[PDB]
């Protein structure tokens, strides 16, 4: 509710990153028909999203023009993509964008070079555009790199406000703290029983072990690269 009902999002050039951890992330709440027009997820099917556990969930929200939503996709290049916000090609997350035309925003349009993915460039250094290395705040060839969007309410789709929230989640590879709501049952040992350990699925004889783990480790693997030893939650 603080990332969707906030009514005040950050500027694109200054996308705030919020960490979500140690809770239950039921995605069924954000399925309203009127918002969430685009739900393009990369690497995870939108239907199979609730029944998965994630360990690194970060939510960055910003307001950009609706015509520039295309640039947010990985691999695309543009003024927003190259100078304001960049996403890696190997991206695993869902980009939800909804129109907010009914409901000051600064975007950077001048930069020496395109930024690496997941970087913030919040600085008011004057971008020179001439032979003269002017350090003044303003000048003929000296231009400020930040300007307000000044969204036009009359405009229908072009140059319209468009809130964008990105949920970059890392797939389960470590002790996870965010997972969907699923009932937990009592473990059964020394019996061939189907199990579901933090999203991992399979069948086997669950037995105790004398192996010693480490605080940053959660799964053991064998020569065949299969989940051999798993420490149960709770």
């Amino acid at each position, epitope marked *: 509710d603080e990332v969707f009902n906030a009514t005040r999002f950050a500027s694109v050039y200054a996308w705030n990153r919020k960490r979500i951890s140690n809770c239950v992330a039921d995605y069924s709440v954000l399925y309203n028909l009127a918002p969430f027009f685009t739900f393009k997820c990369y690497g995870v099917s939108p239907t199979k999203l609730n029944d998965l556990c994630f360990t690194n969930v970060y939510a960055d929200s910003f307001v950009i023009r609706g015509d520039e939503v295309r640039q947010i996709a990985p691999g695309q290049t543009g003024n927003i993509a190259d100078y304001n916000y960049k996403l890696p090609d190997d991206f695993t997350g869902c980009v939800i964008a909804w129109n907010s035309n009914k409901l000051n925003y600064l975007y950077r349009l001048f930069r020496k070079s395109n930024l690496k993915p997941f970087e913030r460039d919040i600085s008011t250094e004057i*971008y020179q*555009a*001439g*032979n*003269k290395p002017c350090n003044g705040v303003a*000048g*003929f060839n*000296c231009y400020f790199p930040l300007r307000s969007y000044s969204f036009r309410p009359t405009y229908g789709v072009g140059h319209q406000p468009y809130r964008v929230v990105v949920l970059s989640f890392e797939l389960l590879h470590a002790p996870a703290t965010v997972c969907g709501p699923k009932k937990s049952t009592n473990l059964v040992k020394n019996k061939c029983v189907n199990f579901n350990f933090n999203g991992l699925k399979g069948t086997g004889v669950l037995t105790e072990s004398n192996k010693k783990f480490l605080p940053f480790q959660q799964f053991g693997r064998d020569i065949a690269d299969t989940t051999d030893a798993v420490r149960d939650p709770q």
Partner: antibody
Amino acid sequence: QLLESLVQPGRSLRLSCAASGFTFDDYAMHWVRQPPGKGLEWVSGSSWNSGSVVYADSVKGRFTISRDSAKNSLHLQMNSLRVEDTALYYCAKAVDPTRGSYSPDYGFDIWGQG
Amino acid sequence: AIRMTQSPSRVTITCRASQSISSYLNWYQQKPGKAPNLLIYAASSLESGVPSRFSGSGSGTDFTLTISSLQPEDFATYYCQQSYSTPLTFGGGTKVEI
């Protein structure tokens, strides 16, 4: 639309170039003098970003330029007009600063009408 | 300051500068009854709407405006102007003759 508006050595005529269509305070409107039978010559230069102003270095002090956002003009003031200085003056708009790289403001464009 | 004098007086026009301008030039076409228009930016580019027949090449102290086949209704004057440093100085000026 950059619509704009003598023999005696001493004059104080005011030259103003009205602006239409494009939005003022976004580029660098400049004034260029073109004597008949000869080429162009930049004489005046304004700045949207700041109040810094550069004139032609052929003669200093005589050239003066100003800005006015409400009426979208420059209102160039000319004092002690030379007999040979008589020419058909042009008001030109600078290219979009979003281009960046090489000097956008120094690059003339449109060159007014008439 | 910066001074130029275009050497000319498939038409190629070259304006030479004393100092190393390094691609800070513009090529301007002025119709006899109209205001001058933009043809080449950054000494090598084409503005929107300009026909592709015009072309600008060269950098440093050598530049060339090449118009291929001498397309008609192009008798207007051609000017060479630099943006390297103030003051803004135009070239000598040359119009194609037929």
